[PDB]
């Protein structure tokens, strides 16, 4: 009764030994419970001879992939090794040859998964992407990156530069020693290119995404959006309007109240907008390795039970704009009042406009209900901007 | 190319289980070489209307339904636990499949139908929420706020500052309440919720009179207010812990944290906060589950039902590689509060922490952390007089 379930693995960093580790203890019960004993046939490695663990010795390590894509024996092959060139050819070349691919690559893109789960359907195999989370959504908004969140809540919280809350980051291992992954905001947008992808069904590309990272963010910005009664996130966001998905990243001042506004340290989380649903929200930190792992091994067993594309269309939904600003300007003149008032004279329409103290000659402006940034508009009017924010959560 | 169905009950749900049917009909013919046929629903009368006039076999007898054996799959979603439970029990006698998203179902009768289910070799299909509440190994507690009118009153309270009979009263005025509340306002609802949550979480059932249940009525604006200002919210938690075999489920008001996740969720908004292993804690937040979210879920429950049948783990991750707090207030004490302060460090067992506040004349409330059991009977048997303890939590 029981079939052999061949595999093969591309890669073995800690994501890769944590699949091997947690099929080899499950072993049994996949066994005894899905008919189907799993072979771990070959693992792919950039290097052969270094030392390793006693148990990944005993399974067949190779350096040539060759050996992996033209093994006819094995049913799915588990791709774990990043990259996008070659990587992303072995995938192609896998499903071509009607091998099912799971792959928990982190530099994989919209383009990519695309081009992957067209060529698998067209080939008739599985193709399974991670990346703990699974129409009508019209826009979300993310913290998608745990170290840049936990500096801003450790600046916000302990009252610290941001280089002081990078380098505590750095003793404490979120981040890294080149953190310009984390910090600039090109991993948040990376994920905001992914989460577009699956909740618009929209291929844009990284360089789509408007994205400015955390590490212009001072601690002055954070007191005064506090004492307005905002937080400083950094927020990857996706609105899709009229066909269109416009996305970014960026040092977003969010209302307290909001859900979002609560996330700190290292939690992420996805808020959720569409017609004509209520507001939804995950919340959960970054998964580490053993989770991958674990999502993969799962994964390995949902392809196994197959021996399917895509969506529900939901028009059943019959029978039943604006954005808002932090403007930071500096060598200002004259009172906040003044500050004020030709604000008032020179903005086009718009729902409310408060002013605060920021510094020296320096004020802050929070305008909600405008079409656009009004960051040229104040600059034509001879004041120097510091800088614009986008602000989210207003009731 | 014939998929034959039956639904138990119309209301929204089941009439946008049909109408999902009919928008995607031609999608899965091609995404199962089959087609769908709603053969019969059942309603309880005929002659109500309006949700519109349509083409399909209605009936009032469910032995039609039950008789027919041509059927692949019974949908229902009629609600009650009788008879529906027994007309389950028959489909899935008969060997017919059966999704059900029927809301007032607890743990005792899913394990019963999942068991009958596995035992006659066809699938069982729960739709819940408070999402579809799998959300599927490494659970030791959750903590929810899963009921929406109870969550708006303690935030119309809050927010306005308003009595809990004005804020009922509004909740009422604006349909959050109905005219008799009590499911909503004693916790009943909530507690039905932590019975199912349990069971998924944990796999284990327990009844409804298990939940330890205490609603919102009594809550009142000193309490919301004292606990502001000692840093806490005042929610109706759900909550469900899993210690030496044995589930500990309760529903009550409790205070929790100001910087916990679930502090800030508001209005009608419901969550489920899950913590587990070495695992980060999660929380799931949106509003119930609409009519429309829930016929979505049982459509593709249908399809993947369709495609197996051909039939259907918890992976082990084994590798290298609590005490409880209480806000209790107490009333005709005399004296300072440097006084009750000092009283309650000498009555008290030994734990972790101790506030005191005014809570009114001649009365004090004290936040404790780190105690087995509430000091009631205990600040009690020592000649004071205990209004109440409410739990607290999110405490770091």
């Given at each position: 009764?029981?079939?052999?379930?061949?595999?093969?693995?591309?890669?073995?960093?800690?994501?890769?030994?944590?699949?091997?580790?947690?099929?080899?203890?499950?072993?049994?019960?996949?066994?005894?419970?899905?008919?189907?004993?799993?072979?771990?046939?070959?693992?792919?490695?950039?290097?052969?001879?270094?030392?390793?663990?006693?148990?990944?010795?005993?399974?067949?390590?190779?350096?040539?992939?060759?050996?992996?894509?033209?093994?006819?024996?094995?049913?799915?092959?588990?791709?774990?090794?990043?990259?996008?060139?070659?990587?992303?050819?072995?995938?192609?070349?896998?499903?071509?040859?009607?091998?099912?691919?799971?792959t928990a690559n982190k530099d994989l893109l919209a383009?990519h998964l695309?081009?992957?789960?067209?060529?698998?359907?067209?080939?008739?195999?599985?193709?399974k992407f991670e990346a703990v989370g699974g129409?009508?959504?019209?826009?979300?908004?993310?913290?998608l990156?745990?170290?840049?969140?936990?500096?801003?809540?450790?600046?916000?919280?302990?009252?610290?530069?941001?280089?002081?809350?990078?380098?505590?980051?750095?003793?404490?291992?979120?981040?890294?020693?080149?953190?310009?992954?984390?910090?600039?905001?090109?991993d948040?947008?990376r994920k905001v290119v992914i989460t577009?992808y699956l909740?618009?069904?929209?291929?844009?590309?990284?360089?789509?995404?408007?994205?400015?990272?955390?590490?212009?963010?001072?601690?002055?910005?954070?007191?005064?959006?506090?004492?307005?009664?905002?937080?400083?996130?950094?927020?990857?966001?996706?609105?899709?309007?009229?066909?269109?998905?416009?996305?970014?990243?960026?040092?977003?001042?969010?209302?307290?109240?909001?859900?979002?506004?609560?996330?700190?340290?290292?939690?992420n989380?996805i808020?959720?907008?569409?017609?004509?649903?209520?507001?939804?929200?995950?919340?959960?930190?970054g998964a580490?390795?053993?989770a991958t792992?674990?999502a993969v091994?799962?994964?390995?067993?949902?392809?196994?039970?197959?021996?399917?594309?895509?969506?529900?269309?939901?028009?059943?939904?019959?029978?039943?704009?604006?954005?808002?600003?932090?403007?930071?300007?500096?060598?200002?003149?004259?009172?906040?009042?003044?500050?004020?008032?030709?604000?008032?004279?020179?903005?086009?329409?718009?729902?409310?406009?408060?002013?605060?103290?920021?510094?020296?000659?320096?004020?802050?402006?929070?305008?909600?209900?405008?079409?656009?940034?009004?960051?040229?508009?104040?600059?034509?009017?001879?004041?120097?901007?510091?800088?614009?924010?986008?602000?989210?959560?207003?009731?």
């Amino acid at each position: 009764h029981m079939k052999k379930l061949n595999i093969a693995l591309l890669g073995l960093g800690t994501v890769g030994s944590g699949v091997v580790k947690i099929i080899e203890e499950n072993r049994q019960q996949i066994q005894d419970t899905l008919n189907k004993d799993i072979v771990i046939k070959h693992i792919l490695v950039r290097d052969k001879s270094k030392k390793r663990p006693l148990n990944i010795s005993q399974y067949h390590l190779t350096e040539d992939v060759n050996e992996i894509l033209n093994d006819d024996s094995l049913d799915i092959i588990v791709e774990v090794m990043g990259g996008i060139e070659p990587t992303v050819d072995w995938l192609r070349t896998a499903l071509k040859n009607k091998k099912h691919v799971i792959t928990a690559n982190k530099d994989l893109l919209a383009v990519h998964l695309k081009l992957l789960e067209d060529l698998a359907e067209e080939n008739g195999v599985a193709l399974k992407f991670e990346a703990v989370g699974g129409n009508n959504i019209s826009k979300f908004m993310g913290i998608l990156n745990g170290t840049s969140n936990f500096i801003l809540s450790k600046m916000t919280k302990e009252q610290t530069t941001f280089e002081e809350a990078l380098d505590e980051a750095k003793r404490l291992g979120f981040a890294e020693a080149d953190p310009t992954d984390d910090v600039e905001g090109v991993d948040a947008a990376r994920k905001v290119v992914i989460t577009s992808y699956l909740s618009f069904n929209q291929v844009i590309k990284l360089n789509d995404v408007k994205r400015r990272g955390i590490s212009g963010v001072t601690l002055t910005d954070i007191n005064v959006a506090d004492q307005l009664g905002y937080k400083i996130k950094l927020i990857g966001k996706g609105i899709y309007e009229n066909g269109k998905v416009n996305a970014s990243v960026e040092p977003t001042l969010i209302d307290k109240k909001h859900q979002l506004a609560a996330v700190e340290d290292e939690y992420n989380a996805i808020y959720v907008i569409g017609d004509a649903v209520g507001d939804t929200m995950f919340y959960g930190k970054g998964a580490g390795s053993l989770a991958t792992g674990s999502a993969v091994v799962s994964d390995l067993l949902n392809v196994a039970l197959f021996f399917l594309h895509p969506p529900h269309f939901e028009l059943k939904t019959d029978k039943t704009e604006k954005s808002n600003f932090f403007v930071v300007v500096n060598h200002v003149k004259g009172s906040i009042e003044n500050f004020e008032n030709e604000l008032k004279a020179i903005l086009p329409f718009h729902r409310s406009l408060r002013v605060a103290n920021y510094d020296n000659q320096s004020y802050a402006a929070v305008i909600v209900g405008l079409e656009s940034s009004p960051e040229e508009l104040i600059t034509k009017h001879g004041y120097e901007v510091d800088k614009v924010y986008p602000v989210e959560g207003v009731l």
